[PDB]
From Swiss-Prot, chain A:
Designated name of the protein: Mediator of RNA polymerase II transcription subunit 15
Compartments, record wording: Cytoplasm; Nucleus
Assembly and oligomerization: Component of the Mediator complex, which is composed of MED1, MED4, MED6, MED7, MED8, MED9, MED10, MED11, MED12, MED13, MED13L, MED14, MED15, MED16, MED17, MED18, MED19, MED20, MED21, MED22, MED23, MED24, MED25, MED26, MED27, MED29, MED30, MED31, CCNC, CDK8 and CDC2L6/CDK11. The MED12, MED13, CCNC and CDK8 subunits form a distinct module termed the CDK8 module. Mediator containing the CDK8 module is less active than Mediator lacking this module in supporting transcriptional activation.
Biological source species: Homo sapiens
Expressing tissues: Expressed in all tissues examined, including heart, brain, lung, spleen, thymus, pancreas, blood leukocyte and placenta. However, the level of expression varied, with highest expression in the placenta and peripheral blood and lowest in the pancreas and kidney.
Residues of the full protein shown: 617 to 785 of 788
Induction: By 12-O-tetradecanoylphorbol-13-acetate (TPA).
UniProt family annotation: Belongs to the Mediator complex subunit 15 family.
Post-translational modification: Ubiquitinated by TRIM11, leading to proteasomal degradation.
From Swiss-Prot, chain B:
Cross-referenced InterPro entries: MED16_bridge, Mediator_Med16, Mediator_Med16_C, Mediator_Med16_N, Quinoprot_gluc/sorb_DH_b-prop, WD40/YVTN_repeat-like_dom_sf, WD40_repeat_dom_sf, WD40_rpt
Protein name in UniProt: Mediator of RNA polymerase II transcription subunit 16
Gene that produces this protein: MED16
WD repeat extents: 9-47, 48-95, 96-141, 142-179, 180-233, 234-290, 291-362, 363-394, 395-429
Keyword annotations: Activator, Nucleus, Repeat, Transcription, Transcription regulation, WD repeat
Swiss-Prot record, chain C:
Full-sequence range covered: 922 to 967 of 1454
The family this protein is said to belong to: Belongs to the Mediator complex subunit 14 family.
Listed name of the protein: Mediator of RNA polymerase II transcription subunit 14
Tissue expression summary: Ubiquitous.
Biological role: Component of the Mediator complex, a coactivator involved in the regulated transcription of nearly all RNA polymerase II-dependent genes. Mediator functions as a bridge to convey information from gene-specific regulatory proteins to the basal RNA polymerase II transcription machinery. Mediator is recruited to promoters by direct interactions with regulatory proteins and serves as a scaffold for the assembly of a functional preinitiation complex with RNA polymerase II and the general transcription factors.
Subcellular location: Nucleus
Assembly, per entry: Interacts with GATA1. Component of the Mediator complex, which is composed of MED1, MED4, MED6, MED7, MED8, MED9, MED10, MED11, MED12, MED13, MED13L, MED14, MED15, MED16, MED17, MED18, MED19, MED20, MED21, MED22, MED23, MED24, MED25, MED26, MED27, MED29, MED30, MED31, CCNC, CDK8 and CDC2L6/CDK11. The MED12, MED13, CCNC and CDK8 subunits form a distinct module termed the CDK8 module. Mediator containing the CDK8 module is less active than Mediator lacking this module in supporting transcriptional activation.
Length: 149, 752, 46
């Protein structure tokens, strides 16, 4: 039963006086019956972390431009203090893995440090395709711990 | 003067520029890349400024406005004198077109060539009797004057290195450009100005260097001969000696910061503002026949350095008798010279003594331009602001209210004759004497000639309405005047479509026949008897009839509304007043009702479709009966007994027989004026309307909840109409082409 | 009988006689007849 009004209205959708036609035919009656009418996501993840992973922003660089660098340094009484891990977030992140900065200048000296690096690079390679800063830092904690073996 | 209102933006420095139009449009450069953009301002609507790209390349150094409005010229420091016209007529959509180019910097004022009409205002020697002697025409000549006797449009522009560029504008539409050196000894022209000498427009192009060099006036004629522009130069008496290089105060005023002929079209008086670091001295000069030679007409005491000089633009007679009665009656406007200082002050100057008439101790003004009635200023402030200061007709002196009445009435009558604009005059009209101004306008319109009243029978209504928007005791009357304008318009566009075949014997136009029958002969209380005693040969092709329905439905709805408002249900004066009670508008509506009956007898489509309650009531006949009763009661003068109990008895039933429609009313807004304050300023923002104080009024086509089509909007009326003539190819062209330029009030269109 | 009561702006509240068809004055809407004399009474309280 709606087909007549349907094709009628569909007929003249283009006309520039269509609004006038709609108003003239209907508004009189309708008034007759009814009366007158820093990426700030990284900020979150940094806020909600575990206390042991005290993370600040790198004094080097200017975090202002699209990606803010990070200089995060492990704490936690149980662990063994190690070298810091310098992070970099691809501001398109999430859906963008935060880079790691590899350097034997950090770990070469000693066995504990080189073992840390082996475990870290392996486990990070395993981490799937969607890394969040929490994933990196958690992986790093597990790496330190597993190197303490 | 208080600030009218001042508006900033939301947030190296280069010289600015501003030019106030004949209508009220300001064009300021506003160097904040939006350093090269021209800003256009509506001046009765700030906060909606159009930013033309202007496509220039260096600082827009000279701006200038056509003597007719409607055209804007902007030259940069690279050479593109570019002519800005009004794209399909709309005040906020400018477009670039024919211009010209010379790679040096046009540093002297671009001038717009002078049409013959100059003006004259016999100020208060005859601010009493009539219009011809108040505002007279002086016999100035044009530049090139024509082939056939009507001036040729064009623009002179002098550039550093002393070139001149005439570039006439042929009615064909293409430019005839030319260039020729001022004097054979080419020299630096840093500050220079152009004005036009009455005798055949032998226009004089003053040109100074920077300091301690003569000011070196020149003479340039224009010579269309040989189908190619030609310009001939002769030197004129040069004027060294700004009179500050001889007082043995040697270098206290090195530079010349300004030189501007005291008024364009008023050569033989030049203002020279020398200056220094924290110092200035201004002097006027006058070329007296003694051999011609310059000599000081006035000079000013040492002053803090001037930042902007603004010249009077209102034509005022400097004759001794006229200035005498101007000093008596204190009609100061014309005798003003706005000097703006670096400290922050603004002084007005006597223009012939260079004393001080007023001050505005209040960041300085780097560009200042007076209005066309000497009642407003426009100060582009250094920080980026914009003020419109009121310059009172009498510089604050409280002289009696009758005298302020006579001042503002003289100015408003000037604006009626020249047709320029009156927003400035509206800035000053107090809420106390709006009714009295309207009364004096009634008088001075009746008295005149019965010939000029036709010239003003459309501007008088606009001025009446714009005045009545003040004075809260009479806001009721503006709606009715803007409705009377629309009624006149419809009557003149429906009595002009008739086109008979017959012309029976005599001189009797069908509209004249309409009126004569309707009024004089058949004051019959019933229609179809008026239809009888008329020739029924009013036949328009059945297309234009159908296109005419959206308008005739107005006259229908308005007759219904007016007759519905007779019982005066509303506590206050309602929005149909003064059309009742003795209007000839009743006669006009009756004429339109008779012609609508005759039309609809041909094509039933083009009739006012009333939603009736009784089915077969012949609604048009009932409305004509009521109109005839009201017009019979209101034709003869005197009777307040028009609402004879029978008539109001019939009228109070009308909601029962029909549905009293809901109309637009077309003030459609309350403009910036009637909102400012008496004294308080009004901070504003560019692009953000003042927070607190859909009908297509010229086609009567309903736009929906949202418009969905672009639409212009009258600046002063409030009107809104659709931009692309959205009717089909078959549409009455006696309307859309009537308002395609200026609307029925007479104000420019603006895009939404 | 079917009087109908429109609510409205700040204070007022309207009272029609709902039987009478709004678009016609001769017709009684569907089944309910009109109430003779209601206008007088509702004016009495006006």
């Amino acid at each position: 039963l709606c087909q007549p009004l349907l094709d009628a209205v569909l007929a003249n959708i283009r006309s520039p006086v269509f609004n006038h036609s709609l108003y003239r035919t209907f508004v009189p009656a309708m008034t007759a019956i009814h009366g007158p009418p820093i990426p700030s996501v990284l900020q979150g993840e940094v806020a909600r972390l575990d206390p042991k992973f005290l993370v600040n922003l790198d004094p080097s660089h200017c975090s202002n431009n699209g990606t803010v660098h990070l200089i995060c340094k492990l704490d936690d009484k149980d662990l063994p203090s190690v070298p810091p891990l310098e992070l970099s977030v691809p501001a398109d992140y999430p859906a963008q893995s935060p880079l790691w900065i590899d350097r034997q200048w950090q770990y070469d000296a000693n066995p504990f440090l080189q073992s840390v690096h082996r475990c870290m690079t392996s486990r990070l390679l395993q981490l799937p395709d969607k890394h969040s800063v929490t994933a990196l830092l958690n992986t790093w904690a597990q790496s330190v711990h597993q190197a303490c073996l | 003067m208080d600030l009218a209102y001042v508006c900033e933006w939301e947030k190296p420095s280069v010289p600015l520029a501003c030019a106030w139009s004949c209508r009220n449009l300001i064009a300021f450069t506003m160097d904040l890349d939006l350093t090269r953009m021209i800003h256009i301002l509506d001046t009765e609507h700030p906060w909606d400024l159009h930013s033309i790209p202007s496509e220039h390349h260096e600082a827009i150094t000279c701006l200038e406005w056509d003597q007719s409005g409607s055209r804007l010229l902007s030259a940069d420091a690279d050479g593109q004198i570019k002519c800005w016209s009004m794209a399909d007529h709309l005040a906020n959509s400018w477009e670039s077109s024919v211009g010209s180019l010379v790679e040096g910097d046009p540093i002297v004022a671009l001038s717009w060539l002078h049409n013959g009409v100059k003006l004259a205002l016999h100020v208060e020697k005859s601010g009493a009797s009539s219009f011809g002697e108040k505002f007279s025409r002086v016999k100035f000549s044009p530049s090139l004057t024509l082939f056939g006797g009507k001036p040729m449009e064009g623009w002179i522009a002098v550039t550093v290195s002393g070139l001149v560029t005439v570039s006439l504008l042929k009615p064909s539409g293409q430019v005839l450009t030319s260039t020729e050196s001022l004097c054979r000894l080419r020299g630096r022209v840093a500050l220079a100005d152009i004005a036009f000498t009455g005798g055949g427009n032998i226009v004089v192009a003053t040109a100074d260097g920077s300091s301690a060099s003569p000011v070196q006036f020149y003479k340039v004629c224009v010579s269309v001969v040989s189908e190619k522009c030609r310009i001939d130069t002769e030197i004129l008496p040069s004027l060294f000696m700004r009179c500050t290089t001889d007082l043995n105060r040697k270098d206290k005023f090195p530079a010349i910061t300004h030189l501007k002929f005291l008024a364009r079209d008023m050569s033989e008086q030049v203002l020279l503002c020398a200056s220094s670091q924290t110092s200035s001295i201004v002097e006027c000069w006058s070329l007296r026949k003694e051999i011609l030679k310059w000599r000081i007409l006035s000079a000013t005491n040492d002053l803090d350095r001037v930042s902007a000089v603004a010249l009077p633009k209102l034509p005022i007679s400097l004759t001794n008798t006229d200035l005498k009665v101007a000093s008596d009656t204190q009609f100061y406007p014309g005798l003003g010279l706005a000097l703006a200082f670096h400290d922050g002050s603004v002084h007005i100057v006597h223009r012939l003594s260079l004393q001080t008439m007023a001050v505005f101790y209040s960041v300085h003004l780097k560009a200042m331009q007076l209005s066309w009635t000497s009642l407003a200023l426009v100060g582009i402030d250094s920080h980026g602001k914009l003020s419109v200061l009121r310059l009172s007709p009498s510089m604050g002196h409280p002289l009696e209210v009758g005298l302020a009445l006579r001042h503002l009435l003289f100015l408003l009558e000037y604006c009626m004759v020249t047709g320029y604009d009156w927003w400035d005059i509206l800035l000053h009209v107090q809420p106390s004497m709006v009714q009295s101004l309207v009364e004096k306008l009634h008088e001075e319109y009746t008295r005149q000639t019965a010939a000029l009243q036709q010239v003003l029978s459309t501007r008088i209504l606009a001025m009446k309405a714009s005045l009545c928007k003040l004075s809260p005791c009479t806001v009721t009357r503006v709606c009715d005047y803007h409705t009377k304008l629309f009624l006149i318009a419809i009557s003149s566009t429906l009595k002009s479509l008739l086109r008979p075949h017959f012309l029976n014997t005599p001189d009797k136009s069908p509209g004249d026949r309409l009126t004569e029958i309707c009024t004089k002969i058949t004051d019959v209380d019933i229609d179809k008897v008026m239809i009888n005693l008329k020739t029924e040969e009013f036949v328009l092709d059945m297309n234009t009839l159908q296109a005419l329905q959206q308008l005739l439905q107005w006259v229908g709805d308005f007759v219904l509304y007016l007759l519905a408002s007779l019982p005066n249900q509303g506590s206050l004066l309602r929005p149909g007043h003064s059309f009742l009670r003795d209007g000839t508008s009743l006669g006009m509506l009756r004429e339109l009702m008779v012609v609508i009956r005759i039309w609809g007898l041909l094509k039933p489509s083009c009739l006012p479709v009333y939603t009736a309650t009784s089915d077969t009531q012949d609604s048009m006949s009932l409305l004509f009966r009521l109109l005839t009763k009201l017009w019979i009661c209101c034709r003869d003068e005197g009777p307040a007994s028009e609402p004879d109990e029978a008539l109001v008895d019939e009228c109070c039933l009308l909601p029962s027989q029909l549905l009293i429609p809901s109309l637009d009313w077309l003030p459609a807004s309350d403009g910036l004026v009637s909102r400012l304050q008496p004294k308080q300023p009004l901070r504003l923002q560019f692009g953000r309307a003042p927070t607190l104080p859909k009908i297509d009024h010229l086609r009567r086509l309903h736009l929906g909840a949202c418009p969905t089509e672009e639409c212009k909007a009258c600046t002063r009326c409030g009107c809104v109409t659709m931009l692309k003539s959205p009717n089909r190819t078959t549409a009455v062209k006696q309307w859309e082409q009537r308002w395609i330029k200026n609307c029925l009030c007479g104000g420019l269109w603006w895009r939404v | 009988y079917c009087i109908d009561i429109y609510c409205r702006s700040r204070g007022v509240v309207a009272i029609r006689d709902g039987a009478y068809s709004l678009f016609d004055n001769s017709k009684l809407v569907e089944g309910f007849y009109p109430a003779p004399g209601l206008k007088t009474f509702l004016n009495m309280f006006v």
